[PDB]
Amino acid sequence: SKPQPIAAANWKCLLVPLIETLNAATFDHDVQCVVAPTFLHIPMTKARLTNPKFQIAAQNAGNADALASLKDYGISWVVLGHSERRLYYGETNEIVAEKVAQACAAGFHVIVCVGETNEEREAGRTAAVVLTQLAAVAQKLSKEAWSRVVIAYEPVWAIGTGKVATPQQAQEVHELLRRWVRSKLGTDIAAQLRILYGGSVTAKNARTLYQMRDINGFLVGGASLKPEFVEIIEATK
Amino acid sequence: SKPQPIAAANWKCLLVPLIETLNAATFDHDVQCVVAPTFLHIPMTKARLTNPKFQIAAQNAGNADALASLKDYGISWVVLGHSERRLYYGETNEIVAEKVAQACAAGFHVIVCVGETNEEREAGRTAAVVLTQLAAVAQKLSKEAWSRVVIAYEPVWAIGTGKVATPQQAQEVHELLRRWVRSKLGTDIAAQLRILYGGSVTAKNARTLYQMRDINGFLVGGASLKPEFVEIIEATK
């Protein structure tokens, strides 16, 4: 069977109505929901979000001390490895991996993003790119650390322009990620590992994406600022 | 008289209608408009934005080489020193200052953000905080570099909660910034320097903010994703 799904909203972006909907929405299946606001918006989200299915996540892991204080503030999830950060803010594979290891060491659940650009895809380098990103991470983690790790695949190649990823192009990557994990860490860690889809997710396509075997949920961009995020969570049933 | 105003939109966040409005809007006074999308959204903005009053700005300055290629792509503005970056992503005063110096060295116009948190304000440290941020920057710049530098004040203390900055609390900071500049660099550089207001700007308050003597425009957050951004630009007349 699949592990527990996650529906994560990455609010990297007046949020009140959105939280209002999340608060009123009732989900009846096991799904961990996660909202990841910017740091300046964490207090306002924490002030208003009441749905007990939701954890609030930070978008960065600064220092062991910074993690400890986050954690004290009630935040124990973080999202790392965002492609924008990787490509344009000098977040090498090792830098992301060290952050994940620190966050893991602080007792956080961590959603680490992997993904290849359109140039890397077109060069047949999809596997090499995402598995190297993932290997950098794995090199720093304990066996037990993996229970609190979640992978998100961001098809950066699709963000750009003129490519829309199909469910099957999503599944191919997720399957490859999970096969590498099974190889390096065993069938145990592999089967329990959430791998979230971090490409274009909407009410329209969430259900079909969730049907793919190695898709355990979503790291949602745009669709997660609108009431439609509720339908995306329901699509994890 | 004031120098040329700037109206900058910081789109740190489906943008098409917004660009549509900017494209249709006609401004008849001298105002440099700037839109600063995320890097993954730069191609889509460049594909659609046609209003010749607008420059597109990047949100980071990685390397001399990365700047050179940005610049080749037609992007010669960048926004740096964002408070979120400063506080939560290890962007010390010196790190921001080095970025500004690199960007300046690459021939960019640069909007550098300064600003103090509510704790620092409450401790009487407003001046010490923003001028130290600014001094770090100034220490790296040539005399001529200042022609292409723009300062933005972000009242981080107001973002948080329960404080709304008045126009006069904006002006007090801007005046202090510009007095320090006049002291260190002369009346010439000081008078020509744009200092933008980077707190809560809307159609409702833009005009009153622009009336303050040392406010040369805006670095707009939320109000710049909506058609109201046009009114904010018009408020610079």
PDB file of C-alpha atoms in Angstrom, chain A:
ATOM      1  CA  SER A   1       0.000   0.000   0.000  1.00  0.00           C
ATOM      2  CA  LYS A   2       1.186   3.639  -0.246  1.00  0.00           C
ATOM      3  CA  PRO A   3       2.526   5.419   2.831  1.00  0.00           C
ATOM      4  CA  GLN A   4       0.613   8.331   4.421  1.00  0.00           C
ATOM      5  CA  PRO A   5       0.132  11.039   1.749  1.00  0.00           C
ATOM      6  CA  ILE A   6       1.204  14.646   2.196  1.00  0.00           C
ATOM      7  CA  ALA A   7      -0.350  17.694   0.704  1.00  0.00           C
ATOM      8  CA  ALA A   8       2.080  20.576   1.015  1.00  0.00           C
ATOM      9  CA  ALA A   9       1.454  24.165   0.044  1.00  0.00           C
ATOM     10  CA  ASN A  10       4.443  26.162  -0.787  1.00  0.00           C
ATOM     11  CA  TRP A  11       3.448  29.771  -0.196  1.00  0.00           C
ATOM     12  CA  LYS A  12       6.611  31.448  -1.388  1.00  0.00           C
ATOM     13  CA  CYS A  13       4.498  34.570  -2.023  1.00  0.00           C
ATOM     14  CA  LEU A  14      -3.646  39.107   2.419  1.00  0.00           C
ATOM     15  CA  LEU A  15      -3.591  35.246   3.037  1.00  0.00           C
ATOM     16  CA  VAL A  16      -6.539  35.345   5.408  1.00  0.00           C
ATOM     17  CA  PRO A  17      -9.332  33.938   3.184  1.00  0.00           C
ATOM     18  CA  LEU A  18      -7.102  31.011   2.203  1.00  0.00           C
ATOM     19  CA  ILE A  19      -6.468  30.005   5.839  1.00  0.00           C
ATOM     20  CA  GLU A  20     -10.216  30.520   6.336  1.00  0.00           C
ATOM     21  CA  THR A  21     -10.959  27.832   3.809  1.00  0.00           C
ATOM     22  CA  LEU A  22      -8.338  25.388   5.208  1.00  0.00           C
ATOM     23  CA  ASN A  23      -9.790  25.922   8.677  1.00  0.00           C
ATOM     24  CA  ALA A  24     -13.372  25.153   7.522  1.00  0.00           C
ATOM     25  CA  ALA A  25     -12.339  22.195   5.335  1.00  0.00           C
ATOM     26  CA  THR A  26     -12.690  18.833   6.974  1.00  0.00           C
ATOM     27  CA  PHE A  27     -10.753  15.881   5.683  1.00  0.00           C
ATOM     28  CA  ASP A  28     -11.686  12.435   6.756  1.00  0.00           C
ATOM     29  CA  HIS A  29      -8.691  10.391   5.508  1.00  0.00           C
ATOM     30  CA  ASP A  30      -5.091  10.225   6.785  1.00  0.00           C
ATOM     31  CA  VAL A  31      -3.197  13.010   5.001  1.00  0.00           C
ATOM     32  CA  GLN A  32      -0.542  15.245   6.573  1.00  0.00           C
ATOM     33  CA  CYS A  33      -1.124  18.735   5.380  1.00  0.00           C
ATOM     34  CA  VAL A  34       1.704  21.221   5.442  1.00  0.00           C
ATOM     35  CA  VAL A  35       1.739  24.957   4.657  1.00  0.00           C
ATOM     36  CA  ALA A  36       5.080  26.584   4.096  1.00  0.00           C
ATOM     37  CA  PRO A  37       4.803  30.372   4.332  1.00  0.00           C
ATOM     38  CA  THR A  38       7.727  32.804   4.074  1.00  0.00           C
ATOM     39  CA  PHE A  39       9.327  33.485   7.427  1.00  0.00           C
ATOM     40  CA  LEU A  40       7.855  36.996   7.663  1.00  0.00           C
ATOM     41  CA  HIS A  41       4.417  35.327   7.204  1.00  0.00           C
ATOM     42  CA  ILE A  42       4.907  32.498   9.684  1.00  0.00           C
ATOM     43  CA  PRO A  43       3.521  34.539  12.660  1.00  0.00           C
ATOM     44  CA  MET A  44       0.397  35.534  10.768  1.00  0.00           C
ATOM     45  CA  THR A  45      -0.168  31.920   9.653  1.00  0.00           C
ATOM     46  CA  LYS A  46       0.441  30.545  13.131  1.00  0.00           C
ATOM     47  CA  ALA A  47      -2.049  33.216  14.506  1.00  0.00           C
ATOM     48  CA  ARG A  48      -4.856  32.001  12.251  1.00  0.00           C
ATOM     49  CA  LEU A  49      -4.402  28.412  11.118  1.00  0.00           C
ATOM     50  CA  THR A  50      -6.457  26.047  13.229  1.00  0.00           C
ATOM     51  CA  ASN A  51      -7.035  22.904  11.197  1.00  0.00           C
ATOM     52  CA  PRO A  52      -5.310  20.189  13.244  1.00  0.00           C
ATOM     53  CA  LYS A  53      -4.396  18.249  10.032  1.00  0.00           C
ATOM     54  CA  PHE A  54      -1.924  21.038   9.213  1.00  0.00           C
ATOM     55  CA  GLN A  55       1.684  21.623  10.148  1.00  0.00           C
ATOM     56  CA  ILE A  56       3.405  24.879   9.324  1.00  0.00           C
ATOM     57  CA  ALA A  57       6.750  24.566   7.643  1.00  0.00           C
ATOM     58  CA  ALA A  58       9.626  26.910   7.269  1.00  0.00           C
ATOM     59  CA  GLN A  59      11.346  27.459   3.886  1.00  0.00           C
ATOM     60  CA  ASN A  60      14.953  27.346   5.118  1.00  0.00           C
ATOM     61  CA  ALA A  61      17.153  25.745   7.721  1.00  0.00           C
ATOM     62  CA  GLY A  62      19.822  28.591   8.849  1.00  0.00           C
ATOM     63  CA  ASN A  63      21.729  27.070  11.776  1.00  0.00           C
ATOM     64  CA  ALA A  64      21.284  24.450  14.521  1.00  0.00           C
ATOM     65  CA  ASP A  65      20.312  27.297  16.815  1.00  0.00           C
ATOM     66  CA  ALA A  66      17.861  28.805  14.286  1.00  0.00           C
ATOM     67  CA  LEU A  67      16.274  25.344  13.913  1.00  0.00           C
ATOM     68  CA  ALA A  68      16.032  24.905  17.698  1.00  0.00           C
ATOM     69  CA  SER A  69      14.187  28.192  18.001  1.00  0.00           C
ATOM     70  CA  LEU A  70      11.886  27.436  15.055  1.00  0.00           C
ATOM     71  CA  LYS A  71      11.122  24.192  16.752  1.00  0.00           C
ATOM     72  CA  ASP A  72      10.380  25.988  20.007  1.00  0.00           C
ATOM     73  CA  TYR A  73       8.036  28.276  18.119  1.00  0.00           C
ATOM     74  CA  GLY A  74       6.026  25.130  17.146  1.00  0.00           C
ATOM     75  CA  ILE A  75       7.406  24.634  13.581  1.00  0.00           C
ATOM     76  CA  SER A  76       8.928  21.210  12.927  1.00  0.00           C
ATOM     77  CA  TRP A  77       8.715  20.916   9.188  1.00  0.00           C
ATOM     78  CA  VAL A  78      10.930  22.584   6.664  1.00  0.00           C
ATOM     79  CA  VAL A  79      11.080  22.578   2.806  1.00  0.00           C
ATOM     80  CA  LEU A  80      14.578  22.622   1.305  1.00  0.00           C
ATOM     81  CA  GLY A  81      16.334  22.276  -2.003  1.00  0.00           C
ATOM     82  CA  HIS A  82      13.876  24.472  -3.953  1.00  0.00           C
ATOM     83  CA  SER A  83      15.007  24.674  -7.595  1.00  0.00           C
ATOM     84  CA  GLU A  84      15.057  28.454  -7.555  1.00  0.00           C
ATOM     85  CA  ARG A  85      17.491  28.276  -4.673  1.00  0.00           C
ATOM     86  CA  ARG A  86      19.616  25.578  -6.315  1.00  0.00           C
ATOM     87  CA  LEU A  87      19.967  27.382  -9.589  1.00  0.00           C
ATOM     88  CA  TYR A  88      20.080  31.053  -8.665  1.00  0.00           C
ATOM     89  CA  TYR A  89      21.108  31.311  -5.020  1.00  0.00           C
ATOM     90  CA  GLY A  90      24.189  28.997  -4.980  1.00  0.00           C
ATOM     91  CA  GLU A  91      22.444  26.165  -3.156  1.00  0.00           C
ATOM     92  CA  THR A  92      24.684  23.321  -4.356  1.00  0.00           C
ATOM     93  CA  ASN A  93      23.747  19.674  -3.715  1.00  0.00           C
ATOM     94  CA  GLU A  94      26.025  19.633  -0.719  1.00  0.00           C
ATOM     95  CA  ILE A  95      24.651  22.862   0.750  1.00  0.00           C
ATOM     96  CA  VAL A  96      21.086  21.443   0.496  1.00  0.00           C
ATOM     97  CA  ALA A  97      22.285  18.111   1.900  1.00  0.00           C
ATOM     98  CA  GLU A  98      23.918  19.842   4.924  1.00  0.00           C
ATOM     99  CA  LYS A  99      20.702  21.752   5.596  1.00  0.00           C
ATOM    100  CA  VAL A 100      18.658  18.556   5.470  1.00  0.00           C
ATOM    101  CA  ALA A 101      21.125  16.833   7.819  1.00  0.00           C
ATOM    102  CA  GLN A 102      20.951  19.820  10.261  1.00  0.00           C
ATOM    103  CA  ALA A 103      17.145  19.929  10.077  1.00  0.00           C
ATOM    104  CA  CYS A 104      17.028  16.127  10.560  1.00  0.00           C
ATOM    105  CA  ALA A 105      19.427  16.450  13.505  1.00  0.00           C
ATOM    106  CA  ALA A 106      17.013  19.083  15.019  1.00  0.00           C
ATOM    107  CA  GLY A 107      14.110  16.597  14.899  1.00  0.00           C
ATOM    108  CA  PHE A 108      12.378  18.184  11.876  1.00  0.00           C
ATOM    109  CA  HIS A 109      10.452  16.548   9.100  1.00  0.00           C
ATOM    110  CA  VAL A 110      12.072  17.698   5.934  1.00  0.00           C
ATOM    111  CA  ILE A 111      10.736  17.947   2.387  1.00  0.00           C
ATOM    112  CA  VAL A 112      13.750  18.053   0.118  1.00  0.00           C
ATOM    113  CA  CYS A 113      13.173  19.087  -3.476  1.00  0.00           C
ATOM    114  CA  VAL A 114      15.004  17.492  -6.458  1.00  0.00           C
ATOM    115  CA  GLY A 115      14.540  18.149 -10.162  1.00  0.00           C
ATOM    116  CA  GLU A 116      16.207  18.719 -13.521  1.00  0.00           C
ATOM    117  CA  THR A 117      16.060  21.647 -15.960  1.00  0.00           C
ATOM    118  CA  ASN A 118      14.849  21.391 -19.555  1.00  0.00           C
ATOM    119  CA  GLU A 119      18.482  21.431 -20.832  1.00  0.00           C
ATOM    120  CA  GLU A 120      19.406  18.611 -18.509  1.00  0.00           C
ATOM    121  CA  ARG A 121      16.296  16.596 -19.514  1.00  0.00           C
ATOM    122  CA  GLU A 122      16.965  17.112 -23.244  1.00  0.00           C
ATOM    123  CA  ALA A 123      20.527  15.806 -22.727  1.00  0.00           C
ATOM    124  CA  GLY A 124      19.225  12.518 -21.224  1.00  0.00           C
ATOM    125  CA  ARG A 125      20.591  13.571 -17.850  1.00  0.00           C
ATOM    126  CA  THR A 126      17.297  13.387 -15.834  1.00  0.00           C
ATOM    127  CA  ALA A 127      18.437  10.370 -13.846  1.00  0.00           C
ATOM    128  CA  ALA A 128      21.963  11.577 -13.314  1.00  0.00           C
ATOM    129  CA  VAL A 129      20.795  15.006 -12.126  1.00  0.00           C
ATOM    130  CA  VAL A 130      18.065  13.949  -9.605  1.00  0.00           C
ATOM    131  CA  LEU A 131      19.944  10.951  -8.215  1.00  0.00           C
ATOM    132  CA  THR A 132      23.060  12.953  -7.689  1.00  0.00           C
ATOM    133  CA  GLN A 133      20.935  15.560  -5.895  1.00  0.00           C
ATOM    134  CA  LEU A 134      19.385  12.747  -3.849  1.00  0.00           C
ATOM    135  CA  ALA A 135      22.740  10.956  -3.258  1.00  0.00           C
ATOM    136  CA  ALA A 136      24.260  14.144  -1.796  1.00  0.00           C
ATOM    137  CA  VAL A 137      21.419  14.128   0.715  1.00  0.00           C
ATOM    138  CA  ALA A 138      21.529  10.377   1.456  1.00  0.00           C
ATOM    139  CA  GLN A 139      25.281  10.585   2.171  1.00  0.00           C
ATOM    140  CA  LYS A 140      24.488  12.661   5.265  1.00  0.00           C
ATOM    141  CA  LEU A 141      21.572  10.773   6.695  1.00  0.00           C
ATOM    142  CA  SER A 142      21.191   8.036   9.266  1.00  0.00           C
ATOM    143  CA  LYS A 143      18.918   5.086   8.575  1.00  0.00           C
ATOM    144  CA  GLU A 144      16.433   6.442  11.107  1.00  0.00           C
ATOM    145  CA  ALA A 145      16.653   9.965   9.627  1.00  0.00           C
ATOM    146  CA  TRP A 146      14.803   8.671   6.538  1.00  0.00           C
ATOM    147  CA  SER A 147      11.546   8.227   8.579  1.00  0.00           C
ATOM    148  CA  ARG A 148      11.324  12.013   8.701  1.00  0.00           C
ATOM    149  CA  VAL A 149      12.543  12.714   5.182  1.00  0.00           C
ATOM    150  CA  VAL A 150      10.139  13.389   2.280  1.00  0.00           C
ATOM    151  CA  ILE A 151      11.283  13.912  -1.320  1.00  0.00           C
ATOM    152  CA  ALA A 152       9.607  16.279  -3.703  1.00  0.00           C
ATOM    153  CA  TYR A 153      10.213  16.154  -7.407  1.00  0.00           C
ATOM    154  CA  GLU A 154      10.064  19.530  -9.080  1.00  0.00           C
ATOM    155  CA  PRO A 155      10.008  19.120 -12.880  1.00  0.00           C
ATOM    156  CA  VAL A 156      11.867  22.440 -13.417  1.00  0.00           C
ATOM    157  CA  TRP A 157      11.838  21.556 -17.166  1.00  0.00           C
ATOM    158  CA  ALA A 158       8.085  21.988 -17.186  1.00  0.00           C
ATOM    159  CA  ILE A 159       7.969  25.313 -15.186  1.00  0.00           C
ATOM    160  CA  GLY A 160       9.819  27.103 -17.982  1.00  0.00           C
ATOM    161  CA  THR A 161       7.768  26.971 -21.160  1.00  0.00           C
ATOM    162  CA  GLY A 162       5.900  24.848 -23.654  1.00  0.00           C
ATOM    163  CA  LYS A 163       6.158  21.527 -21.845  1.00  0.00           C
ATOM    164  CA  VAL A 164       3.410  20.145 -19.634  1.00  0.00           C
ATOM    165  CA  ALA A 165       4.404  17.041 -17.682  1.00  0.00           C
ATOM    166  CA  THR A 166       2.065  14.097 -17.948  1.00  0.00           C
ATOM    167  CA  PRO A 167       1.204  11.885 -14.985  1.00  0.00           C
ATOM    168  CA  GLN A 168       3.345   9.204 -16.600  1.00  0.00           C
ATOM    169  CA  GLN A 169       6.413  11.509 -16.985  1.00  0.00           C
ATOM    170  CA  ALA A 170       5.887  12.252 -13.192  1.00  0.00           C
ATOM    171  CA  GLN A 171       5.633   8.574 -12.304  1.00  0.00           C
ATOM    172  CA  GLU A 172       8.783   7.708 -14.319  1.00  0.00           C
ATOM    173  CA  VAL A 173      10.855  10.067 -12.217  1.00  0.00           C
ATOM    174  CA  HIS A 174       9.247   9.069  -8.942  1.00  0.00           C
ATOM    175  CA  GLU A 175       9.762   5.375  -9.708  1.00  0.00           C
ATOM    176  CA  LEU A 176      13.430   5.994 -10.484  1.00  0.00           C
ATOM    177  CA  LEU A 177      13.869   7.941  -7.234  1.00  0.00           C
ATOM    178  CA  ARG A 178      12.235   5.247  -5.224  1.00  0.00           C
ATOM    179  CA  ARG A 179      14.251   2.466  -6.985  1.00  0.00           C
ATOM    180  CA  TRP A 180      17.541   4.219  -6.058  1.00  0.00           C
ATOM    181  CA  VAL A 181      16.335   4.529  -2.471  1.00  0.00           C
ATOM    182  CA  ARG A 182      15.353   0.797  -2.398  1.00  0.00           C
ATOM    183  CA  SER A 183      18.870  -0.054  -3.714  1.00  0.00           C
ATOM    184  CA  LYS A 184      20.819   2.067  -1.269  1.00  0.00           C
ATOM    185  CA  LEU A 185      18.670   1.862   1.809  1.00  0.00           C
ATOM    186  CA  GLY A 186      16.491  -1.181   1.543  1.00  0.00           C
ATOM    187  CA  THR A 187      12.904  -2.035   0.736  1.00  0.00           C
ATOM    188  CA  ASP A 188      11.834  -0.805   4.189  1.00  0.00           C
ATOM    189  CA  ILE A 189      12.936   2.825   3.918  1.00  0.00           C
ATOM    190  CA  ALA A 190      11.819   2.819   0.216  1.00  0.00           C
ATOM    191  CA  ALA A 191       8.276   1.737   0.827  1.00  0.00           C
ATOM    192  CA  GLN A 192       7.747   4.190   3.642  1.00  0.00           C
ATOM    193  CA  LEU A 193       9.253   7.138   1.760  1.00  0.00           C
ATOM    194  CA  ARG A 194       6.891   9.876   0.595  1.00  0.00           C
ATOM    195  CA  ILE A 195       7.843  11.236  -2.787  1.00  0.00           C
ATOM    196  CA  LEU A 196       5.680  14.252  -3.576  1.00  0.00           C
ATOM    197  CA  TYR A 197       4.964  15.706  -6.989  1.00  0.00           C
ATOM    198  CA  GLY A 198       6.081  19.384  -7.139  1.00  0.00           C
ATOM    199  CA  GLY A 199       5.107  20.263 -10.766  1.00  0.00           C
ATOM    200  CA  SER A 200       1.808  21.861 -11.845  1.00  0.00           C
ATOM    201  CA  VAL A 201      -0.898  20.559  -9.570  1.00  0.00           C
ATOM    202  CA  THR A 202      -4.548  21.716  -9.784  1.00  0.00           C
ATOM    203  CA  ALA A 203      -7.952  20.330  -8.867  1.00  0.00           C
ATOM    204  CA  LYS A 204      -8.163  19.252 -12.532  1.00  0.00           C
ATOM    205  CA  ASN A 205      -5.113  16.953 -12.494  1.00  0.00           C
ATOM    206  CA  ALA A 206      -4.462  16.151  -8.776  1.00  0.00           C
ATOM    207  CA  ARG A 207      -6.534  12.976  -8.765  1.00  0.00           C
ATOM    208  CA  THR A 208      -4.867  11.596 -11.895  1.00  0.00           C
ATOM    209  CA  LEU A 209      -1.449  12.380 -10.499  1.00  0.00           C
ATOM    210  CA  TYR A 210      -2.283  10.692  -7.235  1.00  0.00           C
ATOM    211  CA  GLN A 211      -3.201   7.502  -9.123  1.00  0.00           C
ATOM    212  CA  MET A 212       0.432   7.016 -10.150  1.00  0.00           C
ATOM    213  CA  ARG A 213       2.041   4.406  -8.010  1.00  0.00           C
ATOM    214  CA  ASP A 214       5.083   6.281  -6.661  1.00  0.00           C
ATOM    215  CA  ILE A 215       3.269   9.653  -6.176  1.00  0.00           C
ATOM    216  CA  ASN A 216       2.553  10.183  -2.472  1.00  0.00           C
ATOM    217  CA  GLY A 217       1.126  13.617  -2.626  1.00  0.00           C
ATOM    218  CA  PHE A 218       2.007  17.086  -3.657  1.00  0.00           C
ATOM    219  CA  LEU A 219       4.163  20.147  -3.137  1.00  0.00           C
ATOM    220  CA  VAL A 220       1.807  22.708  -4.587  1.00  0.00           C
ATOM    221  CA  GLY A 221       2.738  26.106  -5.929  1.00  0.00           C
ATOM    222  CA  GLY A 222      -0.011  28.365  -7.338  1.00  0.00           C
ATOM    223  CA  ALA A 223      -3.100  26.251  -6.828  1.00  0.00           C
ATOM    224  CA  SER A 224      -2.410  26.318  -3.053  1.00  0.00           C
ATOM    225  CA  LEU A 225      -3.113  30.057  -2.668  1.00  0.00           C
ATOM    226  CA  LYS A 226      -6.733  29.408  -3.728  1.00  0.00           C
ATOM    227  CA  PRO A 227      -9.711  27.432  -2.287  1.00  0.00           C
ATOM    228  CA  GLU A 228      -8.894  24.716  -4.892  1.00  0.00           C
ATOM    229  CA  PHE A 229      -6.069  23.517  -2.551  1.00  0.00           C
ATOM    230  CA  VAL A 230      -8.804  21.746  -0.590  1.00  0.00           C
ATOM    231  CA  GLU A 231      -9.718  19.673  -3.648  1.00  0.00           C
ATOM    232  CA  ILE A 232      -5.987  18.857  -4.103  1.00  0.00           C
ATOM    233  CA  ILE A 233      -5.910  17.503  -0.539  1.00  0.00           C
ATOM    234  CA  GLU A 234      -9.076  15.534  -1.167  1.00  0.00           C
ATOM    235  CA  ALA A 235      -7.391  14.081  -4.277  1.00  0.00           C
ATOM    236  CA  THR A 236      -5.020  12.213  -1.917  1.00  0.00           C
ATOM    237  CA  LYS A 237      -7.905   9.935  -0.695  1.00  0.00           C
TER     238      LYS A 237
END
